[PDB]
From Swiss-Prot, chain B:
InterPro entries: Rbsml_eL15_core_dom_sf, Ribosomal_eL15, Ribosomal_eL15_arc, Ribosomal_eL15_CS, Ribosomal_uL23/eL15/eS24_sf. One of its GO terms (molecular function) is structural constituent of ribosome. Residues 159-172 have a biased composition (Basic residues). This is Large ribosomal subunit protein eL15.
Length: 92, 196
RNA sequence: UUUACUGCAGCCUGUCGUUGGGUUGUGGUUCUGGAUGUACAGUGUAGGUAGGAGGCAUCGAAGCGGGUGCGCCAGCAUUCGUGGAGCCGUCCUUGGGACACUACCCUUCCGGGACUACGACCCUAACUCUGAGAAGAGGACCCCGAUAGGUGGGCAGUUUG
RNA sequence: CAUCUCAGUAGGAGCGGGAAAAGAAAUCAAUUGAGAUGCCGUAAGUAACGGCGAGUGAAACCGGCACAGUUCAAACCGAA
């Protein structure tokens, strides 16, 4: 499915309808200084690690298209609950 | 400055690999390896360390060099059921330090004496060496000495075996006061060994 | 029982310690003799950016030999010599930078001297094996402690609705 | 069920007395204070930990019992 790259919608911050650009959200790398990373390193020893020796699960048949809507005026983005599509493109 | 020669001995042993003690170390380790487990010596190798630890040049005070192996608690893999946390033992070093092991072996060699203190005197890839100061509580010279006649009391017998030396108290978590000593003082056993 | 899950021994291997001395081969560490720097033409080599102008000299300044630093066999450095005036620019050789002998730390200069991480070789002196020992054979390896990854139904905790 | 729990329990080895251990701050506090240790009460199932599950789990302050302080190494002297 296609969505326009730019369309006019509501900005929650400026509280008006402005043009907004849609940007796909990329998942970031997990920090090594978060409390869960420190806990994993602390629970690392001899033997089973508990939840830190779990193997990651499966995947749903289609993931949601993680989109972020940045207002062109205030340059602030907001993200809304998103649809679930096999193939996603931007309408240009 | 006017510093005592004990200060010069202390300085020489501060960074031993950078002083003349390195060559003495190279020559001495051959002799020390030739020796056994618990060797008596006429004088302490490091006189200043022994004197600050309580050594005196008098009858009833014995100094011994003890040889202890390196690494942690040489442990056997269990041959019955364990839960994978108690199965692994290679990385499990003990809770008994090498210095306190040396003190207890010295005490075992000398049943009539009491361990006073000990200090590090060398090490190589396979051994560490400590010199242990021992006192004869039944010698009249020690009995007269008012800085040492406390060792003639009934509670001073078996000091090293009950963790009452400086190394033992370091191993019991009682080297400091305040925070972190909740489960260590007055004893490890008093808190169900949860400290240490 | 196994190519079930999760671990643990054993074993393989890197790194650190044990662990020293020499020989070279690899990086800059650290700096002496030169500021070696130059589209166009130059009386002249920006003598690093410059008090935008102002010092020396027969008690030294050149057109020359393979041109000692260098380089377009020009010319700054007075040098083994012999020839008998290089300026500074308000005539700026209408400037990638236009220029006073004024403490040059700076793309070079290869005495790279001195410590250094990797690698190769040698030595013995630690260390190892043999012997009662003289000593013989190995040798900074191996063993060993620690740590890192692997392999691992040898073992052992379970799961297998 | 694997971390966890059971639990530093059971069991083991060594030492050891009428008690033992601890014990005179490189402490605890907080804007400025207290003043060795032990034991009891409380803080409090709180803070903290934890397939943040099941569970595990303090201390200080404060109120008491009882109160106690000191000895070396060194500087200076040099066998006194
Ligand atoms: Mg023995
Ligand atoms: Mg006591
Ligand atoms: Mg099995
Ligand atoms: Mg079970
Ligand atoms: Mg004490
Ligand atoms: Mg517990
Ligand atoms: Zn907006």
């Amino acid at each position: 499915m296609k969505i326009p790259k730019r369309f006019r919608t509501y900005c929650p911050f400026c509280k008006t309808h402005n043009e907004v650009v849609v940007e796909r959200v990329k998942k970031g790398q997990a920090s090594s200084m978060t409390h869960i990373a420190r806990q994993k390193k602390r629970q690392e020893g001899i033997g089973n690690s508990g939840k830190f020796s779990k193997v990651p699960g499966g995947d749903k048949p289609t993931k949601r298209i993680w989109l972020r809507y940045r207002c062109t005026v205030c340059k602030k983005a907001h993200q809304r609950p998103c649809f679930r599509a096999k193939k996603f493109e931007f309408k240009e | 400055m006017v510093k005592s020669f004990y200060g010069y001995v202390r300085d020489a042993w501060k960074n031993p690999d950078e002083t003349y003690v390195n060559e003495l170390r190279w020559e001495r380790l051959q002799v020390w390896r030739k020796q056994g487990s618990v060797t008596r010596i006429e004088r302490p190798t490091r006189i200043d360390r022994a004197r600050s630890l309580g050594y005196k040049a008098k009858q009833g005070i014995v100094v011994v060099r003890v040889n202890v192996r390196r690494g942690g608690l040489g442990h056997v893999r269990p041959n019955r059921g364990r839960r994978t946390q108690k199965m692994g033992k290679n990385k499990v070093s003990g809770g008994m330090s090498i210095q306190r092991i040396a003190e207890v072996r010295a005490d075992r060699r000398y049943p009539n004496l009491e361990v006073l203190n000990s200090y590090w005197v060398g090490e190589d890839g396979k051994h560490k060496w400590f010199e242990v100061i021992l006192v004869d509580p039944h010698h009249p010279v020690i009995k007269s000495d008012k800085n040492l006649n406390w060792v003639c009391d009934p509670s001073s017998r078996g000091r090293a075996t009950r963790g009452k030396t400086s190394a033992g108290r370091k191993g019991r978590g009682m080297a400091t006061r305040g925070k972190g000593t909740e489960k260590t003082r007055p004893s490890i056993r008093a808190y169900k060994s949860r400290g240490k």
